[PDB]
Ligand binder design. Structure first.
Ligand SMILES: NC(=O)c1ccc[n+]([C@@H]2O[C@H](COP(=O)([O-])OP(=O)(O)OC[C@H]3O[C@@H](n4cnc5c(N)ncnc54)[C@H](OP(=O)(O)O)[C@@H]3O)[C@@H](O)[C@H]2O)c1
Ligand SMILES: NC(=O)c1ccc[n+]([C@@H]2O[C@H](COP(=O)([O-])OP(=O)(O)OC[C@H]3O[C@@H](n4cnc5c(N)ncnc54)[C@H](OP(=O)(O)O)[C@@H]3O)[C@@H](O)[C@H]2O)c1
Ligand SMILES: CC(C)(C)CC(C)(C)c1cc(Cn2ccnc2)c(O)c(Cn2ccnc2)c1
Lengths: 405, 412
């Protein structure tokens, strides 16, 4: 008999990822696990037909069932509106889901011993989580057309005296100015998600800020994380031989480079600054502050360029790893919530099979290019999308047979 | 006779870099060039003894003489205060010098054909620029202790046409808020140094902003850069088959991965130091990363390695243990400074020397003679053998021998 997997919210997607998502379910998941599957079709055509109601319903199902596994989806732009004759330029499903669930997104690149990394010494991945914006949240920027004062004021609701801070006195010429803010609740949610993420992995957590420059703004993140740690998580961390520390950004960057990895890094970037492989190896998880709800997905898109080749009947070599790890992370979380030992073993075995297959020299073109360099990759160095899924399927059957005896 | 090099401001530093700096002068510079050397000792003990007056005097000397070449220095922290029994936790000399000089910092990793790069396709380096804002430049941040309204207002000098913008209405708790700004003059100075660097190198220039999000704030950078390009640099760029293009970070990153390098990237970021740069701190070797502070005037340049004093190697050297410290970034601080001096003075012999030394440095590594950090890039640290590299002194001797040959060949 198959493993009884319980409740999983699954969101089908678009283009190349939609094809790979179906192959994963048919070849890797369904032959071994029976799920009470709450399946939502987030294909662009279905979101258009339902006036995006499907997206909202999927988000509510994740909130109820605690486990979401999502396929990459098309975020409409002008060209997509014309391509599908869309009724509206629908908002990103990821944006809609994040707004309903809340939480922090943690990204992790899957490491294979034979695949070159930025730091060769990295044996274990580094999991990065950013303090992001709640999609509707913004900064108030404007042009300063000429000389004059820019001030920022706070008027207490409690009737106490208003406080005025001079931002800059433009004495000659103009420029630009802006106002930014953060609510304590957002910082607290960021801290809770980071501590829950570290406890779940059994890895230490680092928070980096620029509190030497933004003494009040970044000092608040530093203080809130330390207050929550001391009160709610410190005993739990010590019990798992892990820790939490604040590090100044400059000091944090250098330490990660001389490290073997295996830590969570919560990042509070300097506000207003710009922030930005193989993408097929990058996983993503939205971790809600409750420590109960997660939504897992590949960090890449729908791979439109490969989908166009597939539509023409041309051979493709699309990496399914990030999509497989969305399934394994969701199933591992489900197993943890349900104390399901068989499901926990399966989720770990599938991750090991995926890494082992690549480490044995069977991989898609993107990874063969990492090893050989794109100018020297030959057809014999890689497997096409379907051949690679078949190899994973064969290795998974072998792994699960060895596990039985 | 030696080359008459003119006025150079030199700043001596600390630990392992202080040792390399002396080797560079003794083996590579002094046998060929005579300088009117304005030498400042920025060693930690001398900064402590002079109450940091030496740092301020060195900054004023660069402003007077236009050419600065600086050795890495210790930035005091609590452990350093205890180690040297320092009088105060002296501020970073780099911070003090940048505050006095102003300007834009450009960082460039030296490429050798046999050394792996982040992107294999890169044949020519990528030069990344960030503007160096003064210590007087800051965001105005504060704690919001409870519910209430945060607004930001602009009151023009004459008192008319005031505008008040709601930032946020804190309805359920407190948090934090801040006001930030940028002056047109700062953006214009950044644009001028960037366009000029692109022309001086004969390379295209790219600017990245988040103008799709900060439509007014980042739009101003895009427009000032675009205006100065269209008006003052468009024809010169086309003449050299080079171009200026604004690009979003996402687009910039993707293009760079498919690029062969050889371009200047101006990044609008406040937090732009190499220390917070995950790519620069984690790829190959910091021993190959150069830095140049380019002042708005186009006349003043301060060159330095974009790494520290290499304390870990200095500790081994103190125990009499063999070290293999890469002097490339330090040598290029000298060659960039001397090339700038040559340009200001129309000194053809000095310009030739500065270029010849850069060529010798790259050629030596390309011929398979390198320090351990580079041998580890090729072989991987666990598989490096002693025969794959040269120690600090052996590598400097090899460079010295190759420089002598190069300059002798150039004479005939
Ligand atoms: N989380 C999400 O739902 C999400 C996120 C981002 C974008 N999107 C959507 O995705 C669509 C396409 O976006 P995009 O083309 O900019 O991004 P993308 O799908 O991430 O693909 C960009 C390129 O990265 C490479 N790549 C990405 N994933 C790969 C994989 N699994 N295997 C092999 N190569 C892979 C391919 O490079 P080569 O072309 O060199 O082969 C591909 O053309 C858009 O409609 C966008 O809205 C969705
Ligand atoms: N511009 C400046 O004056 C400046 C800049 C940064 C830091 N600092 C100061 O420098 C001191 C030491 O800082 P740190 O140890 O954090 O940074 P670091 O001097 O840059 O050295 C960090 C590590 O990078 C490698 N490395 C750096 N430069 C190298 C070179 N030329 N050749 C070979 N390997 C090289 C070494 O790695 P391995 O250990 O693996 O060999 C070294 O231990 C501190 O007092 C700090 O304040 C000054
Ligand atoms: C073209 C552009 C934008 C520079 C992107 C690119 C190519 C990814 C890139 C390249 C280098 C240069 N480098 C290579 C080895 N050592 C230094 C960087 O320092 C950063 C830093 N960074 C990280 C994030 N943003 C900037 C990014």
């Amino acid at each position: 008999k198959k493993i009884s997997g319980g409740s999983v919210v699954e969101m089908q997607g678009d283009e190349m990822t939609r094809i790979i998502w179906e192959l994963i379910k048919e070849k890797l998941i369904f032959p071994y696990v029976e799920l009470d599957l709450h399946s939502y079709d987030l294909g662009i055509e279905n979101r258009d037909a339902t006036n995006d109601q499907v997206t909202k319903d999927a988000a509510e199902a994740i909130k109820k069932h605690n486990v979401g596994v999502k396929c990459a989806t098309i975020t409409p732009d002008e060209k997509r509106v014309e391509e599908f004759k869309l009724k509206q330029m629908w908002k990103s499903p990821n944006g809609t889901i994040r707004n309903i669930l809340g939480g922090t997104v943690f990204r992790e690149a899957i490491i294979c011993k034979n695949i070159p990394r930025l730091v060769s010494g990295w044996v274990k991945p580094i999991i990065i989580g950013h303090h992001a914006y709640g999609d509707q949240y913004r900064a108030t920027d404007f042009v300063v057309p000429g000389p004059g004062k820019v001030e920022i004021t706070y008027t207490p609701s409690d009737g106490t005296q208003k406080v005025t801070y001079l931002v800059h006195n433009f004495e000659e010429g103009g420029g630009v100015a802006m106002g930014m803010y953060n609510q304590d609740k957002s910082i607290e949610d960021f801290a809770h998600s980071s501590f829950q993420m570290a406890l779940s992995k059994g890895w230490p957590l680092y928070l980096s800020t620029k509190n030497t420059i933004l003494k009040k703004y970044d000092g608040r993140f530093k203080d809130i994380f330390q207050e929550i740690y001391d009160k709610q998580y410190k005993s739990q961390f010590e019990a798992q031989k892990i820790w939490y520390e604040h590090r100044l950004i400059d000091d944090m960057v250098a330490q990660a480079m001389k490290s073997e990895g295996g830590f969570i890094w919560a990042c509070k970037n300097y506000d207003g600054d710009v922030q930005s492989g193989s993408l097929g190896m990058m996983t993503s998880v939205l971790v809600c502050p409750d420590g109960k709800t997660v939504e897992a997905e590949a960090a890449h898109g729908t791979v439109t360029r490969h989908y166009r080749m597939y539509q023409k009947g041309q051979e493709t070599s699309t990496n399914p790893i990030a999509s497989i790890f969305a399934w394994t992370r969701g199933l591992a979380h489900r197993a943890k919530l349900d104390n399901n030992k068989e499901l926990a073993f399966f989720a770990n075995a599938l991750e090991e099979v995926s890494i082992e297959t690549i480490e044995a020299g069977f991989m898609t073109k993107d990874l063969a290019a990492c090893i050989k360099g794109l100018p020297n990759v030959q057809r014999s160095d890689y497997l096409n999308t379907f051949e690679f899924m078949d190899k994973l399927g064969e290795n998974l059957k072998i792994k699960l047979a060895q596990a039985k005896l």
